[PDB]
Amino acid sequence: TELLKPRTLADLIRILHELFAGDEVNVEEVQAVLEAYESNPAEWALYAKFDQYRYTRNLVDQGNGKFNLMILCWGEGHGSSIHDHTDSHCFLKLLQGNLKETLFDWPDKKSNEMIKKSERTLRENQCAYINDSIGLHRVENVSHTEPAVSLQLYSPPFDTCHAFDQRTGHKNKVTMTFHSKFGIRTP
Ligand SMILES: [Fe+2]
């Protein structure tokens, strides 16, 4: 329950280990610390590996199996589908550029179009939080000129999240994969 400003991404990763030592998690302490790290591109550029057609997930640290810490690279116009988070804590800090998170309601079992609950446009260094009991979201880099990089930490770690047909609400199970791990590109 001691939180200092993390000098560096590596300092950040150490603090996050201390916070995730136990069984439970204090969601606001994790989020305060992410927001406290000033984005420093020289420290994370290794992991900012872009693909031209969709956003990539670059694993930075496995958190002794209590959380995945990854960085996501969004090419301008890249978006996720609408997804849940497998009953998990999900933190998203912007390291560069801007993303637009659109919050949706869990659809009812009718084949009816999901409609936006709210939206908000995250700017650099802000850290947002979502979990399944808040709703489904969809992050997008709607910029046409600038890429986005975001830092994200999920606990527990999960490989599979669901994708939601926006018109129907029908879900499909999707399996997350990694563009790189620890700076190393994994096909
Ligand atoms: Fe998400």
Side-chain angles (χ1 to χ4, degrees):
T1 40
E2 185 270 26
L3 318 180
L4 295 139
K5 195 213 177 49
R7 282 121 183 71
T8 57
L9 163 70
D11 208 56
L12 179 70
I13 297 186
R14 169 197 99 253
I15 298 182
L16 288 170
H17 289 163
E18 277 155 10
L19 295 182
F20 282 95
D23 288 339
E24 77 290 53
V25 50
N26 205 334
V27 155
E28 292 99 1
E29 287 176 351
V30 180
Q31 159 162 38
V33 190
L34 293 163
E35 194 137 11
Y37 167 61
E38 286 177 47
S39 185
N40 187 5
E43 321 187 328
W44 51 259
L46 171 69
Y47 315 107
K49 299 192 192 304
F50 279 80
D51 194 81
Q52 154 147 62
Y53 308 105
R54 68 148 263 213
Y55 75 91
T56 56
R57 303 165 188 268
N58 312 271
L59 182 79
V60 168
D61 197 86
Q62 268 161 328
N64 303 125
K66 329 213 80 173
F67 60 86
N68 284 344
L69 185 70
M70 61 203 79
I71 298 178
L72 266 66
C73 298
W74 320 74
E76 295 85 357
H78 290 185
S80 70
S81 59
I82 307 163
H83 52 283
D84 66 334
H85 294 93
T86 320
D87 308 320
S88 278
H89 300 300
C90 190
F91 298 85
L92 178 152
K93 192 229 180 58
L94 261 299
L95 295 172
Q96 151 162 323
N98 314 266
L99 302 167
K100 159 181 281 190
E101 162 182 48
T102 291
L103 304 109
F104 291 100
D105 278 353
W106 284 100
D108 53 43
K109 228 61 183 168
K110 187 66 186 185
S111 81
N112 262 338
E113 153 154 281
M114 315 170 50
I115 293 171
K116 82 282 176 179
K117 172 171 59 163
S118 58
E119 86 187 10
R120 50 146 156 186
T121 176
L122 312 164
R123 302 104 194 139
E124 286 206 8
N125 278 291
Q126 320 177 348
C127 178
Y129 173 71
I130 196 179
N131 66 79
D132 278 347
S133 77
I134 300 165
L136 319 166
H137 75 164
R138 184 222 294 282
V139 189
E140 293 151 292
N141 182 25
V142 295
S143 194
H144 299 236
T145 46
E146 169 96 18
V149 189
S150 55
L151 183 69
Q152 294 148 26
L153 165 153
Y154 302 110
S155 178
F158 64 89
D159 314 45
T160 67
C161 55
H162 293 98
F164 289 81
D165 205 347
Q166 184 167 337
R167 310 241 193 159
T168 293
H170 182 57
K171 49 159 192 146
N172 267 9
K173 191 175 192 193
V174 183
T175 179
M176 213 205 289
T177 192
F178 287 110
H179 191 72
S180 78
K181 305 179 134 180
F182 321 99
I184 297 305
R185 167 79 156 110
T186 65

